Amino acid sequence: SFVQTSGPQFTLDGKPFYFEGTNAYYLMTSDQSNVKQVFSDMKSLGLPVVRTWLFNLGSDSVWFQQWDSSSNKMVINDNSDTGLGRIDYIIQQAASQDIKLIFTLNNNWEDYGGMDYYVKNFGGTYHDDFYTNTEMIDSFKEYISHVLNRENSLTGVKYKDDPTIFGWEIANEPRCVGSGDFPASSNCSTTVTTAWIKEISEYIKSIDSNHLVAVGDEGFFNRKGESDYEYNGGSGMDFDAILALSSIDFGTFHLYPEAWSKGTDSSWSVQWIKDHAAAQADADKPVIMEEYGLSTDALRVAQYPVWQGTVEDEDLAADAFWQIAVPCSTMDGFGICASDNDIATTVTNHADAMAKK
């Protein structure tokens, strides 16, 4: 069936759906043997959901969008081998393994182009131009329409009608400020961020009435006069105002204490989860810690069981760690292999416990 929501829980068929999922942004660039590998590793590790990239703006070997300097147009790549046909294959192997997909449709940062690609090529100078500019928004829309409407060239199923897809995410980790190539206006706020989130999620809802929609943000709050950047709306994001939109089915938050300098031993991280589990309880919508990570094996064996035990007790709908590694590699520091010896205590113990719930 299609993944649904019933109050604070995700639901699949008649039953509530608690899970540990994972990330593999790199599925869009992986060879077929490795796309298959991801899903069989996930399966035996007891992971039923994976979050991954469905945006790729540029002119490398794989691209989904790209600016045409001759045509003055943002053009889309339907190619079997260099473009969206790669997504078709991902959805196919996912469905073959009874695994579900969270597709993120854009990115805040400059990895694989993201928002800044739109801003550069349309003539904008500010990152948050993407949040207001009607011309830029219409290019994001036409892309969304194309992706949701696409027929799967291997299975004949339109994306919007595909039960294999868990749900759509607007963009990865939106802030007012990006990677650095383009700065933020004084014009950007929590009002502007939230309104952009509103109409894009509504635009998704008008085409696709089967799937869930979320933002894919880090989960930053806008609570007046709280201490940290992640709680006081300094980022220009407002988790509360996002989760309050009827156009958003579930809330998303990320956990990166090292990047945010919150100490990889203290109580801030546990408090961070609890705080989002409370927002799940206080509004009546599921929330997912869809990204979390620690830079070292030793940090992960230390804190993952703690964080995961929090997710269990707080009754958080689900969580997805960053990130699974195929081929087996440390990758960016956060890469976890299924071949890892301590996989049970980093990943496995928790996956079963969410499966059981």
JSON list of N, CA, C and O in Angstrom, two decimals, residues 268-302:
[
{"chain": "A", "resi": 268, "resn": "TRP", "atom": "N", "xyz": [22.94, 17.50, 25.15]},
{"chain": "A", "resi": 268, "resn": "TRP", "atom": "CA", "xyz": [22.25, 18.32, 24.15]},
{"chain": "A", "resi": 268, "resn": "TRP", "atom": "C", "xyz": [21.55, 17.50, 23.10]},
{"chain": "A", "resi": 268, "resn": "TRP", "atom": "O", "xyz": [20.44, 17.84, 22.68]},
{"chain": "A", "resi": 269, "resn": "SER", "atom": "N", "xyz": [22.19, 16.41, 22.68]},
{"chain": "A", "resi": 269, "resn": "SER", "atom": "CA", "xyz": [21.70, 15.58, 21.60]},
{"chain": "A", "resi": 269, "resn": "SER", "atom": "C", "xyz": [20.48, 14.77, 22.01]},
{"chain": "A", "resi": 269, "resn": "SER", "atom": "O", "xyz": [19.51, 14.69, 21.25]},
{"chain": "A", "resi": 270, "resn": "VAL", "atom": "N", "xyz": [20.54, 14.16, 23.19]},
{"chain": "A", "resi": 270, "resn": "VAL", "atom": "CA", "xyz": [19.39, 13.46, 23.73]},
{"chain": "A", "resi": 270, "resn": "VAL", "atom": "C", "xyz": [18.24, 14.45, 23.90]},
{"chain": "A", "resi": 270, "resn": "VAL", "atom": "O", "xyz": [17.12, 14.17, 23.51]},
{"chain": "A", "resi": 271, "resn": "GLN", "atom": "N", "xyz": [18.53, 15.60, 24.50]},
{"chain": "A", "resi": 271, "resn": "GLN", "atom": "CA", "xyz": [17.51, 16.65, 24.64]},
{"chain": "A", "resi": 271, "resn": "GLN", "atom": "C", "xyz": [16.92, 17.07, 23.29]},
{"chain": "A", "resi": 271, "resn": "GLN", "atom": "O", "xyz": [15.74, 17.39, 23.20]},
{"chain": "A", "resi": 272, "resn": "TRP", "atom": "N", "xyz": [17.74, 17.05, 22.24]},
{"chain": "A", "resi": 272, "resn": "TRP", "atom": "CA", "xyz": [17.33, 17.43, 20.89]},
{"chain": "A", "resi": 272, "resn": "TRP", "atom": "C", "xyz": [16.29, 16.49, 20.32]},
{"chain": "A", "resi": 272, "resn": "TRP", "atom": "O", "xyz": [15.31, 16.94, 19.70]},
{"chain": "A", "resi": 273, "resn": "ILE", "atom": "N", "xyz": [16.51, 15.19, 20.51]},
{"chain": "A", "resi": 273, "resn": "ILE", "atom": "CA", "xyz": [15.57, 14.15, 20.08]},
{"chain": "A", "resi": 273, "resn": "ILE", "atom": "C", "xyz": [14.26, 14.27, 20.86]},
{"chain": "A", "resi": 273, "resn": "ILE", "atom": "O", "xyz": [13.19, 14.42, 20.26]},
{"chain": "A", "resi": 274, "resn": "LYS", "atom": "N", "xyz": [14.35, 14.22, 22.19]},
{"chain": "A", "resi": 274, "resn": "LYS", "atom": "CA", "xyz": [13.20, 14.38, 23.08]},
{"chain": "A", "resi": 274, "resn": "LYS", "atom": "C", "xyz": [12.35, 15.59, 22.65]},
{"chain": "A", "resi": 274, "resn": "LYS", "atom": "O", "xyz": [11.12, 15.49, 22.56]},
{"chain": "A", "resi": 275, "resn": "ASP", "atom": "N", "xyz": [13.01, 16.72, 22.38]},
{"chain": "A", "resi": 275, "resn": "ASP", "atom": "CA", "xyz": [12.32, 17.94, 21.94]},
{"chain": "A", "resi": 275, "resn": "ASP", "atom": "C", "xyz": [11.52, 17.76, 20.65]},
{"chain": "A", "resi": 275, "resn": "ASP", "atom": "O", "xyz": [10.43, 18.30, 20.52]},
{"chain": "A", "resi": 276, "resn": "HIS", "atom": "N", "xyz": [12.06, 17.01, 19.70]},
{"chain": "A", "resi": 276, "resn": "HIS", "atom": "CA", "xyz": [11.32, 16.69, 18.48]},
{"chain": "A", "resi": 276, "resn": "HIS", "atom": "C", "xyz": [10.27, 15.63, 18.66]},
{"chain": "A", "resi": 276, "resn": "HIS", "atom": "O", "xyz": [9.21, 15.70, 18.03]},
{"chain": "A", "resi": 277, "resn": "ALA", "atom": "N", "xyz": [10.52, 14.65, 19.53]},
{"chain": "A", "resi": 277, "resn": "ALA", "atom": "CA", "xyz": [9.51, 13.65, 19.90]},
{"chain": "A", "resi": 277, "resn": "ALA", "atom": "C", "xyz": [8.32, 14.30, 20.60]},
{"chain": "A", "resi": 277, "resn": "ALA", "atom": "O", "xyz": [7.20, 13.82, 20.49]},
{"chain": "A", "resi": 278, "resn": "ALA", "atom": "N", "xyz": [8.58, 15.37, 21.33]},
{"chain": "A", "resi": 278, "resn": "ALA", "atom": "CA", "xyz": [7.54, 16.15, 21.99]},
{"chain": "A", "resi": 278, "resn": "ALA", "atom": "C", "xyz": [6.71, 16.92, 20.96]},
{"chain": "A", "resi": 278, "resn": "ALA", "atom": "O", "xyz": [5.50, 17.03, 21.09]},
{"chain": "A", "resi": 279, "resn": "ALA", "atom": "N", "xyz": [7.38, 17.45, 19.93]},
{"chain": "A", "resi": 279, "resn": "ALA", "atom": "CA", "xyz": [6.68, 18.21, 18.89]},
{"chain": "A", "resi": 279, "resn": "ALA", "atom": "C", "xyz": [5.78, 17.28, 18.08]},
{"chain": "A", "resi": 279, "resn": "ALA", "atom": "O", "xyz": [4.73, 17.70, 17.60]},
{"chain": "A", "resi": 280, "resn": "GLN", "atom": "N", "xyz": [6.21, 16.01, 17.95]},
{"chain": "A", "resi": 280, "resn": "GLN", "atom": "CA", "xyz": [5.39, 14.94, 17.36]},
{"chain": "A", "resi": 280, "resn": "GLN", "atom": "C", "xyz": [4.16, 14.66, 18.21]},
{"chain": "A", "resi": 280, "resn": "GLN", "atom": "O", "xyz": [3.07, 14.45, 17.67]},
{"chain": "A", "resi": 281, "resn": "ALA", "atom": "N", "xyz": [4.34, 14.64, 19.53]},
{"chain": "A", "resi": 281, "resn": "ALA", "atom": "CA", "xyz": [3.23, 14.39, 20.44]},
{"chain": "A", "resi": 281, "resn": "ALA", "atom": "C", "xyz": [2.29, 15.59, 20.58]},
{"chain": "A", "resi": 281, "resn": "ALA", "atom": "O", "xyz": [1.09, 15.41, 20.73]},
{"chain": "A", "resi": 282, "resn": "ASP", "atom": "N", "xyz": [2.83, 16.80, 20.52]},
{"chain": "A", "resi": 282, "resn": "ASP", "atom": "CA", "xyz": [2.06, 18.02, 20.80]},
{"chain": "A", "resi": 282, "resn": "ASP", "atom": "C", "xyz": [1.30, 18.53, 19.57]},
{"chain": "A", "resi": 282, "resn": "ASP", "atom": "O", "xyz": [0.23, 19.13, 19.69]},
{"chain": "A", "resi": 283, "resn": "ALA", "atom": "N", "xyz": [1.87, 18.31, 18.40]},
{"chain": "A", "resi": 283, "resn": "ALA", "atom": "CA", "xyz": [1.09, 18.34, 17.17]},
{"chain": "A", "resi": 283, "resn": "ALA", "atom": "C", "xyz": [0.77, 16.87, 16.95]},
{"chain": "A", "resi": 283, "resn": "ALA", "atom": "O", "xyz": [1.29, 16.02, 17.66]},
{"chain": "A", "resi": 284, "resn": "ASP", "atom": "N", "xyz": [-0.10, 16.54, 16.02]},
{"chain": "A", "resi": 284, "resn": "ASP", "atom": "CA", "xyz": [-0.45, 15.13, 15.90]},
{"chain": "A", "resi": 284, "resn": "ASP", "atom": "C", "xyz": [0.07, 14.56, 14.58]},
{"chain": "A", "resi": 284, "resn": "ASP", "atom": "O", "xyz": [-0.68, 13.99, 13.81]},
{"chain": "A", "resi": 285, "resn": "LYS", "atom": "N", "xyz": [1.37, 14.74, 14.35]},
{"chain": "A", "resi": 285, "resn": "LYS", "atom": "CA", "xyz": [2.04, 14.34, 13.10]},
{"chain": "A", "resi": 285, "resn": "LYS", "atom": "C", "xyz": [3.33, 13.60, 13.41]},
{"chain": "A", "resi": 285, "resn": "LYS", "atom": "O", "xyz": [4.06, 13.98, 14.33]},
{"chain": "A", "resi": 286, "resn": "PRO", "atom": "N", "xyz": [3.63, 12.55, 12.62]},
{"chain": "A", "resi": 286, "resn": "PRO", "atom": "CA", "xyz": [4.88, 11.83, 12.82]},
{"chain": "A", "resi": 286, "resn": "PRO", "atom": "C", "xyz": [6.07, 12.74, 12.53]},
{"chain": "A", "resi": 286, "resn": "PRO", "atom": "O", "xyz": [5.98, 13.65, 11.68]},
{"chain": "A", "resi": 287, "resn": "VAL", "atom": "N", "xyz": [7.15, 12.50, 13.27]},
{"chain": "A", "resi": 287, "resn": "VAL", "atom": "CA", "xyz": [8.41, 13.18, 13.04]},
{"chain": "A", "resi": 287, "resn": "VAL", "atom": "C", "xyz": [9.46, 12.09, 12.86]},
{"chain": "A", "resi": 287, "resn": "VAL", "atom": "O", "xyz": [9.35, 10.99, 13.42]},
{"chain": "A", "resi": 288, "resn": "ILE", "atom": "N", "xyz": [10.46, 12.39, 12.02]},
{"chain": "A", "resi": 288, "resn": "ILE", "atom": "CA", "xyz": [11.52, 11.45, 11.72]},
{"chain": "A", "resi": 288, "resn": "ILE", "atom": "C", "xyz": [12.87, 12.14, 11.83]},
{"chain": "A", "resi": 288, "resn": "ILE", "atom": "O", "xyz": [13.10, 13.21, 11.25]},
{"chain": "A", "resi": 289, "resn": "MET", "atom": "N", "xyz": [13.76, 11.54, 12.63]},
{"chain": "A", "resi": 289, "resn": "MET", "atom": "CA", "xyz": [15.15, 11.95, 12.67]},
{"chain": "A", "resi": 289, "resn": "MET", "atom": "C", "xyz": [15.79, 11.29, 11.47]},
{"chain": "A", "resi": 289, "resn": "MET", "atom": "O", "xyz": [16.33, 10.19, 11.56]},
{"chain": "A", "resi": 290, "resn": "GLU", "atom": "N", "xyz": [15.71, 11.97, 10.34]},
{"chain": "A", "resi": 290, "resn": "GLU", "atom": "CA", "xyz": [16.00, 11.31, 9.07]},
{"chain": "A", "resi": 290, "resn": "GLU", "atom": "C", "xyz": [17.48, 11.35, 8.72]},
{"chain": "A", "resi": 290, "resn": "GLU", "atom": "O", "xyz": [17.91, 10.66, 7.80]},
{"chain": "A", "resi": 291, "resn": "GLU", "atom": "N", "xyz": [18.23, 12.19, 9.43]},
{"chain": "A", "resi": 291, "resn": "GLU", "atom": "CA", "xyz": [19.69, 12.17, 9.36]},
{"chain": "A", "resi": 291, "resn": "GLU", "atom": "C", "xyz": [20.25, 12.24, 10.77]},
{"chain": "A", "resi": 291, "resn": "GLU", "atom": "O", "xyz": [19.86, 13.08, 11.57]},
{"chain": "A", "resi": 292, "resn": "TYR", "atom": "N", "xyz": [21.16, 11.32, 11.07]},
{"chain": "A", "resi": 292, "resn": "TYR", "atom": "CA", "xyz": [22.04, 11.48, 12.22]},
{"chain": "A", "resi": 292, "resn": "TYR", "atom": "C", "xyz": [23.37, 10.83, 11.97]},
{"chain": "A", "resi": 292, "resn": "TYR", "atom": "O", "xyz": [23.46, 9.87, 11.20]},
{"chain": "A", "resi": 293, "resn": "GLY", "atom": "N", "xyz": [24.41, 11.37, 12.58]},
{"chain": "A", "resi": 293, "resn": "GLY", "atom": "CA", "xyz": [25.74, 10.85, 12.36]},
{"chain": "A", "resi": 293, "resn": "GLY", "atom": "C", "xyz": [26.78, 11.30, 13.35]},
{"chain": "A", "resi": 293, "resn": "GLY", "atom": "O", "xyz": [26.67, 12.38, 13.94]},
{"chain": "A", "resi": 294, "resn": "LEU", "atom": "N", "xyz": [27.79, 10.46, 13.54]},
{"chain": "A", "resi": 294, "resn": "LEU", "atom": "CA", "xyz": [28.99, 10.81, 14.27]},
{"chain": "A", "resi": 294, "resn": "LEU", "atom": "C", "xyz": [30.21, 10.38, 13.46]},
{"chain": "A", "resi": 294, "resn": "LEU", "atom": "O", "xyz": [30.18, 9.35, 12.77]},
{"chain": "A", "resi": 295, "resn": "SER", "atom": "N", "xyz": [31.27, 11.20, 13.52]},
{"chain": "A", "resi": 295, "resn": "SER", "atom": "CA", "xyz": [32.45, 11.08, 12.66]},
{"chain": "A", "resi": 295, "resn": "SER", "atom": "C", "xyz": [33.30, 9.83, 12.86]},
{"chain": "A", "resi": 295, "resn": "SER", "atom": "O", "xyz": [34.10, 9.48, 11.98]},
{"chain": "A", "resi": 296, "resn": "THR", "atom": "N", "xyz": [33.19, 9.17, 14.00]},
{"chain": "A", "resi": 296, "resn": "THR", "atom": "CA", "xyz": [34.05, 8.01, 14.24]},
{"chain": "A", "resi": 296, "resn": "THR", "atom": "C", "xyz": [33.26, 6.81, 14.71]},
{"chain": "A", "resi": 296, "resn": "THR", "atom": "O", "xyz": [32.20, 6.94, 15.33]},
{"chain": "A", "resi": 297, "resn": "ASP", "atom": "N", "xyz": [33.80, 5.63, 14.41]},
{"chain": "A", "resi": 297, "resn": "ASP", "atom": "CA", "xyz": [33.25, 4.37, 14.87]},
{"chain": "A", "resi": 297, "resn": "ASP", "atom": "C", "xyz": [33.04, 4.44, 16.37]},
{"chain": "A", "resi": 297, "resn": "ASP", "atom": "O", "xyz": [31.93, 4.18, 16.86]},
{"chain": "A", "resi": 298, "resn": "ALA", "atom": "N", "xyz": [34.09, 4.81, 17.09]},
{"chain": "A", "resi": 298, "resn": "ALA", "atom": "CA", "xyz": [34.08, 4.90, 18.54]},
{"chain": "A", "resi": 298, "resn": "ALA", "atom": "C", "xyz": [33.03, 5.88, 19.10]},
{"chain": "A", "resi": 298, "resn": "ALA", "atom": "O", "xyz": [32.42, 5.60, 20.12]},
{"chain": "A", "resi": 299, "resn": "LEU", "atom": "N", "xyz": [32.81, 7.02, 18.43]},
{"chain": "A", "resi": 299, "resn": "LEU", "atom": "CA", "xyz": [31.73, 7.93, 18.83]},
{"chain": "A", "resi": 299, "resn": "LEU", "atom": "C", "xyz": [30.37, 7.30, 18.60]},
{"chain": "A", "resi": 299, "resn": "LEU", "atom": "O", "xyz": [29.46, 7.45, 19.42]},
{"chain": "A", "resi": 300, "resn": "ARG", "atom": "N", "xyz": [30.23, 6.59, 17.49]},
{"chain": "A", "resi": 300, "resn": "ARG", "atom": "CA", "xyz": [28.99, 5.93, 17.16]},
{"chain": "A", "resi": 300, "resn": "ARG", "atom": "C", "xyz": [28.65, 4.78, 18.12]},
{"chain": "A", "resi": 300, "resn": "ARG", "atom": "O", "xyz": [27.52, 4.69, 18.60]},
{"chain": "A", "resi": 301, "resn": "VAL", "atom": "N", "xyz": [29.61, 3.91, 18.44]},
{"chain": "A", "resi": 301, "resn": "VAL", "atom": "CA", "xyz": [29.35, 2.84, 19.42]},
{"chain": "A", "resi": 301, "resn": "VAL", "atom": "C", "xyz": [29.01, 3.39, 20.81]},
{"chain": "A", "resi": 301, "resn": "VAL", "atom": "O", "xyz": [28.34, 2.73, 21.61]},
{"chain": "A", "resi": 302, "resn": "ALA", "atom": "N", "xyz": [29.46, 4.62, 21.08]},
{"chain": "A", "resi": 302, "resn": "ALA", "atom": "CA", "xyz": [29.20, 5.32, 22.33]},
{"chain": "A", "resi": 302, "resn": "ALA", "atom": "C", "xyz": [27.81, 5.93, 22.41]},
{"chain": "A", "resi": 302, "resn": "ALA", "atom": "O", "xyz": [27.12, 5.78, 23.42]}
]
